[PDB]
Symmetry: C2
Subunit: 80 residues, 2 copies
């Protein structure tokens, strides 16, 4: 029953400047810890550097709000 | 192990305009649901009506962010 935690991850991610939706989220329990992988949408006209910064901001925001997450990998794809 | 959920309640409550800290929070599981009772601080110079509105706003904010809560009673006390 991972809906509640995944809902929290998505909402946290979406509240970060530059996030155009969560394209993909795979979360799994490793013991009582969550390890996750996420792909966010970003403006196709952002620079690669900006997209990297937005990914780092999502990582901080999400990990800050969901204490059980012990690994979170965030990548980005162009989204209009 | 109610720390994580109680931390979430407190943080949610504090982010509501007019909340001057959480003075008291008693939360308990009833099955897999949380029932809670909270006292917030408010400006002593707010009206009784305003304090009521702030309590209602905390109730909405908290219940909106913590899905397992099925009852939340919020009251207010003067805090400088």
């Amino acid at each position: 029953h991972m809906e509640a935690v995944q809902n929290r991850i998505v909402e946290a991610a979406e509240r970060v400047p530059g996030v155009r939706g969560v394209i993909h989220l795979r979360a799994r329990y490793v013991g009582q810890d969550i390890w996750a992988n996420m792909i966010i949408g970003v403006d196709p006209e952002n620079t690669v550097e900006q997209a990297h910064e937005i990914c780092e901001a999502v990582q901080a925001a999400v990990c800050g709000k969901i204490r059980r997450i012990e690994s979170l990998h965030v990548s980005a794809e162009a989204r209009e």
